[PDB]
Amino acid sequence: MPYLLISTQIRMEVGPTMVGDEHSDPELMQQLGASKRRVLGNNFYEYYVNDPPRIVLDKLECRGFRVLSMTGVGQTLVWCLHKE
Amino acid sequence: MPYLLISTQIRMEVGPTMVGDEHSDPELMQQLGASKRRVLGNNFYEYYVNDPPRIVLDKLECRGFRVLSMTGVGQTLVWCLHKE
Amino acid sequence: MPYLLISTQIRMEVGPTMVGDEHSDPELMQQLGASKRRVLGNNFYEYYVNDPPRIVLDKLECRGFRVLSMTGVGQTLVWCLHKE
Amino acid sequence: MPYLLISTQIRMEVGPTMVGDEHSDPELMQQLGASKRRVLGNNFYEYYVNDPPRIVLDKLECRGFRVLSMTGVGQTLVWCLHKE
Amino acid sequence: MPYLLISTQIRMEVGPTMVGDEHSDPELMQQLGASKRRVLGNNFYEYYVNDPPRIVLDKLECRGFRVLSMTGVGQTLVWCLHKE
Amino acid sequence: RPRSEEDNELNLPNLAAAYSSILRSLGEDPQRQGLLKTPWRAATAMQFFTKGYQETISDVLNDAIFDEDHDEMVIVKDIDMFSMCEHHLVPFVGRVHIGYLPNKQVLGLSKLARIVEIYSRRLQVQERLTKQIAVAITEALQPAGVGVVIEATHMCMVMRGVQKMNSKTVTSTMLGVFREDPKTREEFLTLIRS
Amino acid sequence: RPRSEEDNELNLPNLAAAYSSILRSLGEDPQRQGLLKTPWRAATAMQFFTKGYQETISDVLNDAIFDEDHDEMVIVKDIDMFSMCEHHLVPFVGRVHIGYLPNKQVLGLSKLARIVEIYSRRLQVQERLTKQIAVAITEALQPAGVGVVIEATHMCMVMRGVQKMNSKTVTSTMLGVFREDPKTREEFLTLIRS
Amino acid sequence: RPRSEEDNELNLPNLAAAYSSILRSLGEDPQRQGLLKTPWRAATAMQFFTKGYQETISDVLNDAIFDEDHDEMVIVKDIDMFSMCEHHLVPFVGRVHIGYLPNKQVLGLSKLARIVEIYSRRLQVQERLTKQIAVAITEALQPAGVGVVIEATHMCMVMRGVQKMNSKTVTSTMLGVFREDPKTREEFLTLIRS
Amino acid sequence: RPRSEEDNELNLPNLAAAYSSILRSLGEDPQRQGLLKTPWRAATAMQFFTKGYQETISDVLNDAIFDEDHDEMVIVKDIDMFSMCEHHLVPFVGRVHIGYLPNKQVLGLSKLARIVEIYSRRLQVQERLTKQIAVAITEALQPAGVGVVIEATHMCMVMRGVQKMNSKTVTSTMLGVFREDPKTREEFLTLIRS
Amino acid sequence: RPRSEEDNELNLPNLAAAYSSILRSLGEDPQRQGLLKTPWRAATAMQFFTKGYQETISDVLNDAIFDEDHDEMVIVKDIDMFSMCEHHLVPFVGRVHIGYLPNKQVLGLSKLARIVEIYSRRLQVQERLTKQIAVAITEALQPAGVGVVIEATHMCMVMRGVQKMNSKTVTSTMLGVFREDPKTREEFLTLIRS
Amino acid sequence: RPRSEEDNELNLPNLAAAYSSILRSLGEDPQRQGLLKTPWRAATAMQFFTKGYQETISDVLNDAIFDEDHDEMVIVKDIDMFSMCEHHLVPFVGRVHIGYLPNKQVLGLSKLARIVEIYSRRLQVQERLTKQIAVAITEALQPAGVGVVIEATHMCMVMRGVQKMNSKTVTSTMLGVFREDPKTREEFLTLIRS
Amino acid sequence: RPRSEEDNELNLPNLAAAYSSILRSLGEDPQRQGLLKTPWRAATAMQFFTKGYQETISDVLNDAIFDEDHDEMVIVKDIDMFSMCEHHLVPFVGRVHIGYLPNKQVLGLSKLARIVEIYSRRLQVQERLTKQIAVAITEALQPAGVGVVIEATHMCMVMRGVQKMNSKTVTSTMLGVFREDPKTREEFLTLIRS
Amino acid sequence: RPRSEEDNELNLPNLAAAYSSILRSLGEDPQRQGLLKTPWRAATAMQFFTKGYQETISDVLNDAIFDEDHDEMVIVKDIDMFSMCEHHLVPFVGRVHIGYLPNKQVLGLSKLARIVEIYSRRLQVQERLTKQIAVAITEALQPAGVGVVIEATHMCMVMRGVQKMNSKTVTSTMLGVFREDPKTREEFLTLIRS
Numbered sequence A, B, C, D, E: 001m002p003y004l005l006i007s008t009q010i011r012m013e014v015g016p017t018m019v020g021d022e023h024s025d026p027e028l029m030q031q032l033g034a035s036k037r038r039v040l041g042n043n044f045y046e047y048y049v050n051d052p053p054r055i056v057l058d059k060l061e062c063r064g065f066r067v068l069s070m071t072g073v074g075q076t077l078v079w080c081l082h083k084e
Numbered sequence F, G, H, I, J, K, L, M: 001r002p003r004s005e006e007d008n009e010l011n012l013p014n015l016a017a018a019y020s021s022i023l024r025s026l027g028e029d030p031q032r033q034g035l036l037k038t039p040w041r042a043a044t045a046m047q048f049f050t051k052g053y054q055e056t057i058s059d060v061l062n063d064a065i066f067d068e069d070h071d072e073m074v075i076v077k078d079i080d081m082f083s084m085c086e087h088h089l090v091p092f093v094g095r096v097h098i099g100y101l102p103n104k105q106v107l108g109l110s111k112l113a114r115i116v117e118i119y120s121r122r123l124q125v126q127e128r129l130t131k132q133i134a135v136a137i138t139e140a141l142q143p144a145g146v147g148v149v150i151e152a153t154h155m156c157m158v159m160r161g162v163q164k165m166n167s168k169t170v171t172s173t174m175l176g177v178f179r180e181d182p183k184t185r186e187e188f189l190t191l192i193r194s
Ligand SMILES: N[C@@H](Cc1ccccc1)C(=O)O
Pocket: A008, A009, A010, A011, A012, A075, A076, A077, D073, D074, D075, D076, M180, M181, M182
């Protein structure tokens, strides 16, 4: 599992920050302190964290991930990270 | 065929994920388990997969592709991959 | 002439693909089989091709260009390529 | 703290430029001459600077940061910087 | 002054191209043949050029700058360049 | 357990007595030629307004769901709805607007209207009514998304509050693509807009 | 005897109890977080809707009647009114249109508005309400004539009946020249018409 | 004899058969997944549109007629009505406007609404529907006069004829003073006018 | 095989016989002076409503398609349409809105109108009717895109359901650029919006 | 002698030739890809606008006149009508309003509509068209009176004259009681007014 | 070569002759008192409707173009326009909306109005008319962009087709920034929207 | 004696002081950055609202009264007027409708408008203001008759009273033939009606 | 310190005296039959317009805030409001529209209405009134966002300025997601738009 995707909305200086989907590494999710949920109406679970994306990026580097690309889409800021 | 383009819409944690066009490598498409179709009204065929883009990215790395760029456009999240 | 810009609209799996402006290398344009035109109302000429951007990216690699960045703007998907 | 996020709005040739969140390095913020505030209605503090993003990028290089990615989202231009 | 920001709007195959702000290097601006102005209502000056962004990118490479990132935002296409 | 015809008849008398009590408690003589049958009529009315309790989405469900291989937004707008405010027991009147992105399965108009009646005819809160209709549609169709919007005039601000029959309360529940895709939400709001 | 603040306080509990009873008699749990304070708000509301009983035309009367040596038609139209159906205890909402041919004495707006409030905020019958407002104006001014017209929507036909909020009931009372002279009657209806 | 619940059930099958026949007679396959239950639904519908046959003014009558010592015009307007053309078996939709000069006795809204329903839910001719509603009111109240006006849109000219949904048919029946006194007639037409 | 003038005449009697049967099954005397010719008028009507079966897009096709070197959106809005509900055999009336991005080839108004009539005059389901008109246009023009929006009132909720003629159903089909380019879709909805 | 299907086909060519002439006489090349089939279409259109000549009131007459024992005003309003200005051969578009006091005999809608079509689809003068429709109804019914009002926009004042599409021309014909009794006339103008 | 006052007089008889022929080919007597001067009036009218051929953008051009150092969108909306359908020779009436982003040079109202008249008063196709006006404005101002929208009713669908005067045709042409910038396009549609 | 510019200046300070007092008497700090210049502005406003006192019908009179040998009704309607309620010193806004039957002499618009301003801009009572305008016109023209009608919203029932901005007060004064001839009165009310 | 009933009675005389002064200072005789009680009524009115000073959000607060586990936009629009211009002491009337994104906690209508009344019934500036209501709601709910828009007519531009009652002033305050997320802001402006 080399790739990871995280995102935040409306504003970058505050969370929540989405850190994973249903098939995400349970350990990594736990390391980040990410909660899991399925918003009413959605057909999928998501892992989130209350930290600002910047904080989640630092933690992620410690686990060996690096930011490959960052992009906006709608009102969503997305980071694409790659491990090794 | 060094370049590849994949994409998803509205949400990143779930598919479908578009993995190819009419002139895509049939073998690679088969390896991904991609179906082919032509939406009514469109003058072109597209290869899709029900997996989340993150899963498709991992599979693609096993076949030698690396993510060069990721961007949003409209409600579409797009990844540009390059082989070798 | 180290930089090149190409683009497509609405959908990525089909063309046309814009491959050049009025001051583009005539030889390169010819190699890509690009037509030239000036849309009514516009004060500029444009070189286009009927191929999907993915196909144009492969041909461009053969001539020594590499994708540096990809971005969306409006309903336009744009690739920034650099030679050597 | 390897990652840093800055941003500006509407126009790039003029500030303000957002340089940090509540958990930003106080020293770095002071070095940039960044003020701190919490806009009415928002549940978070932000560090800003009256300089154009380009000026803030030069200062940030002096402190060892490099631009990894730049993206637009809404009417906000965002830069993702990484130190070492 | 290692970083530079240039941009164009609506269409990429034609100018004008924004090449600088009020605190830009006067020499570099002169080398590009950039005019200066302050649009009515705006509280800032801007340096522009009538050339297409692609042309401006070539000239800029001659002066030692390289494209680090390109992004869309609104109807504005933006290039982030870095010198050395 | 869903209320039933029996429950009503066995309770009618209790309601009639309560209203007859209220008549007195206000200053009226429940004996007047025109106030005699009121305790009963009041009671029958108060039951008709809450007859939704004696039903369940199930009674409607499968009876009318057709396959039409449709996967584009469908909208039923300007549906009249009358309900009872669980706070003052005063009714709030208005309109309901429903839209959904089918996953091959479509709902019949009557069935849709039946779902609205079932939850509106009972003590309610606009925010809750909105959400129940949305979920009921989601469960009965497994659609890609669904949106519900209610606009109503609350009579406890018309007569009460002071004199504000002008005021309007707008609530909405957006599930699936209607929640995540700003474009679908905009189109939905545009198509019911006029 | 006119109802009074004391009467209310001494009856509030009785109402609250009747409503709390009804809640049960319908199927609800008077204990739910949102139904707890309902029996009281319901009683309070029901008293505000009938606060007209605790007043009389006298309280208003002389307080505001001026001499303006005027002897031509005076019309106050589009006066919002809210009342209760003595038949189902459901409210009927609408507008009131008043007109009178003064005999030197004119009535102030506030006083006029108070006369409408007094008789409308109580269990009523549109026909009666129309007549009471008319006679009250006749008594407080000895005019050459007076006309009152009420147009209202009865909620017991909007929700009940089937679904008839469209329906409008129009009643009128013409006294004096308003009854005997067709010309005055026509001018009055023309002037409120638009 | 008034049609009854038994009659319907004993005839439903006969109707279903007739429609199942028509389906074929037109070129359709009564077997399609979407046409299967049609013969029955079409039949049920056709019975609902003519359910007025299973009722009489008597059922309504006395049940709700009150003494309010009123003797001035009373009007109920904009009553929605739906009916069936006995000529093409295509429905005509519209509005009903009723007015009457009571002779002490007044009719309650529900009852009035029920009278309209009874004669309109059956095969009709606008001119007949207008007159029947008017005579029914006259019999149930011995009023000094009564007036009925119907304005409807006929689908046998909207779709058929060419494309005339614009066209509106207006019929009226004026009895008593509504017939003999032009002033009453004018006031009634004025009051429903807007 | 498309229905023909022969099929009609060879079936009219079977239709008239079914309707004469229904008349009886409801309680009427098919003999009344005004019901005699009804079975035939009903039958004739029911065939006019489904006369679209005796046609095909081909009959229209090439007859009127001109080259105008146009490649910008063309919209025809507020096209009246009348159709039959295949579920209750009751009609639904409304308006059709069409737009398409031509690929040099344009369609003639008359032809476009004929396409709508062909599919609407037959037993339908709004969702399906919307889709057939859309594809029909895509086939007769090979355009860059096409959009169709239908808004209609279903009489099986006006009279039936309770009384909901207020309700409106909105359906749409977006092919080509109309589906993929949000901007085209918005502009289309804006230009028909008002 | 009423024009006939034979007459048309034997004249179509003559018309086509005249129009093909006009095309040249104006500056156009009747050979253009878009102007080729024009002379025929133009000719076809011009015959449809005058297809009223090939008919007579007789064709309509008795076919649909029913006995309903009705003797009160019947009104059919807002009937769309198109016609040709015999003076400039430019059409005038508008609406026809009809009313009549039946003498037991009533007229069917379709028949009434056919009467309007007959006289309007032919070269006309508004004043005359109004009168012919009025007389046609009087002959087909022997009523106690009849009224016809036409309001139309004349295209020879919209484009021509300067730019006056705003202007409207109103004509009327009142026969029988509609002429003699000012009261009937007023009621008729009131009932079509709105 | 632009048509001229001589060409007309030399051709008017040719037109009058053609119409005199048509009058006969239809069944009329070109001799009636009111039909005598028709062939000439019809001819005079047909020339007036096509007087656009005897003009060129040149006649207008430079005559009224002022420098006002303006570089923001300018809009002239609701410009009435009348034209002729080259396919049926029937007119289509409507409105034109024009917008453009000036490059220092602006266009005067009269001149703009004259540009519209020039191309509308001649045999047309809505799509073409929209485009010609668009390009005419582009040539006379070298603007950064220009947009044109035309909404119109086609008489060949009002009378003909069946009865569809309700139908509206919308066409647009967007050049320059009006084509490439969605934001400019949206603002333009907003400012003409209402 | 008519108020004058001198009086104003000699009193402005007084007013300013009265208002400054009121500010305190209410709880405000007359020193706040936004309340400093208020006492003066308020005073200036209160003088402008009552500037009518510094004028007389004479100042207007003869200056503009022309002979046009006209003897048929002349009407000037929808004249905006603003005034002050002498009872609460709160303004009442509305419209004035004037009509008169000249006796050769006609009044000029500006002059008429000045007469309305003179009596409206001062402490008033609707009845009196209506009457004063009517007599003023009567004196300035010796007409055969004159009618004045005022409809206005009184802000002392919009904010005060409860919330009745809906309510409108209509007053009128009819002199001469407008009083004695019902026909003249009706036509005046008709011509201003719409 | 919030103003109180005592404060009023202790100040009424002072206000009365200030107005009595103004009366004279204008040219009026405070003794006139109709001007006698004015100074008091004027004073009482001015206190009612500023009765907001004797209240605080606290009085409202917790008394009515329910938990309904809702987290989607809630809107209350067209709330009538009346206020006083702190600059001219003239009132400005209009409507307030409110929206917020609840964080589980919702606000009852009456409470919301009370908040608006509290800040509007006092000397104000529209920009300020908007912001205060927005903040008051943010504190009484800790919502994820809140928006407030006010549109009003300022009487100091209707009568004063010249005559501009047409003019409307719109102000807004967006807090939270309503400020940062353009999509939320748009949906909010759409849902109150109509
Ligand atoms: N909401 C911001 C963009 C943004 C969203 C999410 C994260 C960062 C920035 C805007 O509208 O400009």
